[PDB]
Structures are given as structure tokens and as C-alpha cells.
């Protein structure tokens, strides 16, 4: 357990600009065909978003690179990845991401997503390890590789899978999934949006609206988070790790006043970042 990959060079992080991003409903109350202004953590429009490749492949056979570092949670965390194939089963949120600190773990290995709030002693490099079961033609991924042990678990929960990929798109969609993670007053809300994107990597011009699946009272501040990668062993070819290539975008929410446009449907469409421009 606790397998660690440092490879050779982490490499400079890639950078991208999202014209419209981090749009979600701040207020639960339903509003239709009205204009409302609220101040909440939001991703600023037309702002640089850091791009990190969890697995990086050079233009040569193999040479897989573990380029994903621990990232500070900050005021808020935004996760965007095309993820046509789901390798980001879950995200680990902890103040120290260590034992003696309440750690939030999400696993999508099970058919229904499982959310845990127990202290976990995470290894320096934490990733899920997948072993062929050899029974029922199935592959099983273990969170034991991610953390040595679980103790003092304040709480636990079961939810529908946050990441769902119907597949068969063969491109033109990319099965893009957008996730918003924020902790306010000891309460954590997870937002899931699925948007078809023609562009292979660059985020689409169209606004995306995110709705919170559930509200969880974690009760502990989170100042660091890291992605989880499900990796399967590779056998002799003429232990295998970092199979495939994974790229993910992280945007940090900043508290801002956002103008909200409500459709007759009530879904948020247009959004304005107040300090971005004089208009």
C-alpha cells in the first residue's frame, strides 16, 4: 500500500482562460424571469484558470509523469475535466490531509458514490490501486493505497454517483463534468454539471449552471485538497502504474457580487462579475 510516484520533473503548470465559469445558484429560493444580485464565492469571469495534468505523456513510448501536487483549498475550489473515462473517482479534502484531522473522501468505485468524513493518514502520493478480482470479470479499486487507516469518523454518507459517463459519444461531447466545492460555516456543498463540449480541451463559451446534490455539515475547515487516480496493474508486454493520461483544471472561487439572470425555466443563464469591468 502507499505506493508513491515522483517520476523526474513535475513540469510547469499549463494555463487557460475561461470566458464564463463557476456559475451556480447561491439562493435555494426559486426565481423565474427576474434579475437578482447576491455576493458569494464565485469563479471570476475572463480570469486565468490553472491547468494541471495528473498524468503527463511525452511524445515518446511510455514516459508517464505523476504531475498532480497537493493543492490548497483557498476560499473555494472549482474542478473541471472532460473525463470521458472516469479516473477521478473522488477528491480528498483535509485541513492537513493527515490522521487526527477530519478528512473528506469520495469513492466512485462502488455503483453509488460513497462519501466518508473520517481521519485518514494519507501517503505522500495517494492514488487508488486497481486489482483484477478474477471473479465475475470485474476490476476492484482499493482506497487502502490512498490512506493507511481510518479513525475517529465523525460521520459517513451514501449518494448517487457524482461522475456519470454514458459514453458512445466518440468525441464532440467529451463527457465534460464540472464540480464546485465550497466550505462555509462548517457546511460543504458539492455541485455537479454535465456539459457536451465540441472543443477537445478549451472550456466552452456557453454558461454552465451547477446545482448542489446535497449539503453536508463537515464541521471542519479544509485548507488543502488533492485528486484521486484509479490505476490498474500492467502485466508483461513485448507493478504497472499511471495507466492512461489524465488532465484536470482547478479554479479557486473568490467571494464576489454576481448579477443573476433567471429564465422562465428558472435555470441561471447569464452571469456578471461586478469588479471585472466598469460596465
Amino acid at each position, epitope marked *: 500500500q502507499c505506493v508513491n510516484l515522483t517520476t523526474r520533473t513535475q513540469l510547469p503548470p499549463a494555463y487557460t482562460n475561461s470566458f464564463t465559469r463557476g456559475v451556480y445558484y447561491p439562493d435555494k429560493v426559486f426565481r423565474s424571469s427576474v434579475l437578482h444580485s447576491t455576493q458569494d464565492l464565485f469563479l471570476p469571469f475572463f480570469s486565468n484558470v490553472t491547468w494541471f495534468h495528473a498524468i503527463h505523456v511525452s511524445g515518446t513510448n511510455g514516459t508517464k509523469r505523476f504531475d498532480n501536487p497537493v493543492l490548497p483549498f483557498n476560499d473555494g475550489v472549482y474542478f473541471a475535466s472532460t473525463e470521458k473515462s472516469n479516473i477521478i473517482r473522488g477528491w480528498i479534502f483535509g485541513t492537513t490531509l493527515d490522521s487526527k484531522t477530519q478528512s473528506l473522501l469520495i469513492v466512485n468505485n462502488a455503483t453509488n458514490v460513497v462519501i466518508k468524513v473520517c481521519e485518514f493518514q494519507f501517503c505522500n502520493d495517494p492514488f487508488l490501486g486497481v*486489482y*483484477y*478480482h*478474477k*471473479n465475475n470479470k470485474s476490476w476492484m479499486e482499493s482506497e487502502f493505497r490512498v490512506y493507511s487507516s481510518a479513525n475517529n469518523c465523525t460521520f459517513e454518507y451514501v449518494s448517487q454517483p457524482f461522475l456519470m459517463d454514458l459514453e458512445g459519444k466518440q468525441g464532440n461531447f467529451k463527457n465534460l463534468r464540472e464540480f464546485v466545492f465550497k466550505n462555509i460555516d462548517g457546511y460543504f456543498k458539492i455541485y455537479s454539471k454535465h456539459t457536451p463540449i465540441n472543443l477537445v480541451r478549451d472550456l466552452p463559451q456557453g454558461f454552465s449552471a451547477l446545482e448542489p446534490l446535497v449539503d453536508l455539515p463537515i464541521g471542519i475547515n479544509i485548507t488543502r485538497f488533492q485528486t484521486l487516480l484509479a490505476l490498474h*496493474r500492467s*502485466y*508483461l508486454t*513485448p*507493478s504497472g502504474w499511471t495507466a492512461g493520461a489524465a488532465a484536470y483544471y482547478v479554479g479557486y472561487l473568490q467571494p464576489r457580487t454576481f448579477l443573476l439572470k433567471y429564465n422562465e425555466n428558472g435555470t441561471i443563464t447569464d452571469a456578471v462579475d461586478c469588479a471585472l469591468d466598469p460596465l
Partner: antibody
Amino acid sequence: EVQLLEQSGAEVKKPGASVRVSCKVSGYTLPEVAMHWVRQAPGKGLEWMGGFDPEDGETMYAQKFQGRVTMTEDTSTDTAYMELSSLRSEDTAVYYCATTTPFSSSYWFDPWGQGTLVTV
Amino acid sequence: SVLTQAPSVSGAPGQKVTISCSGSSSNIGNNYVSWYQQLPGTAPKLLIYDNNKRPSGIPDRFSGSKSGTSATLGITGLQTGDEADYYCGTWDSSLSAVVFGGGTKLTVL
């Protein structure tokens, strides 16, 4: 890549006994990969034994030797016990732990236990 | 056992000579062939798998072929340390098991 851990090691069994053979692994977990067994008599050749079947999912048993030797598995401790019974005069042979790929369409023995000699 | 290979063969060093194993359609015909090497009192080492694949750490000098029921193990660039027995094997559906030949102990002259 992966080296099989030592199996039985040194075992001495006078006639009138029977011996288990416990082959563990390292760098893999036991039930992601199938084990196998081969009789090797010194100054002689290979005689295959035991084994798991990629098809049908059963753990094979060599028909010639079927019923005399059995196998069990502890997945967490990676202990696979090969029990041979009813010692015979020519039965004693060096036994090498063997393993084939889980993906199937494979036959090559892959890593080896290094070899242990049973006694009759 | 059920297959055909001679006990021993000899050749001068640095030369090129191979070793073949004669099976049947019931064994080599529909099945892939493997080859193994063992030094005296040592661990038998996989030589070539599938008639076209060489395991990690194998000199590229080794090749292989399957012609009908006959499978030759390509052996080239003889070395002073190449003297050992080579074993043919392939999957058997007859007894539905794994089979081998008696083994052929090479000698580098």
C-alpha cells in the same frame, strides 16, 4: 518487475507423510494473477501440475495427478497451499511455483518460486 | 513427456544453430508455444513466449517460428554461458492441461 516470494523453502518428509506448499508473492496481490505448478525431478524434465484455468475460472488439477494434490488460497495473506499426499518412491521432485497472466490467452509460466524439493 | 525434442545437442561457440520441438495439431497446432531455460540446480527461465515475443531482459538474438505442428526456437550468437537445457511447451486441450517436452541440453563446443 515482480518477484515471487519464497514458497515451501526447505521441507523434509520421511515416507508416511504429506506436505503442503505455500507460495506467497510480492508486488502483486494474490487473486489478480493465477498460480501454477510443475513437477521437476532432478536429472529429468518438466511435469506440469496444479494450476488455475483462465477459462471456466476453475483451479485446474493435472488429470494424471488429479485427486492426490489439492490447492487452497488466502487472498489477503497471499498464501496458496499445495498439498500433495500419499508419498510414492518416484513422487519426490523439485516443485517450482509458476504463474500465468489474468487477461487469459496466456500459457508462459512468467515469474518462478526459485524451486523447493519435497521428500518421500 | 508427450512432445518431441532430443536430450542434447552441441555446437561451436559464436555460431548460429537452433532447436526445434515437434508437436501435434492437438497441442501446438491451435496453441501458442513457450520456451524455457534452466542452469544446473537453478530457476527455469522463460525464453520466448508466443513464438514472437521475448520477455524483459532477453537478448534480441533469440527468435522463433511455428510451422504446422513444428515449432523451432531461434538460437543465435552462441555464448560460453549459453549451455543449458531448453524446454518447449504449449497449451494442451487433449488432457486440457499444460504439457512439455523432455528437454534438450545444449552444449557450446
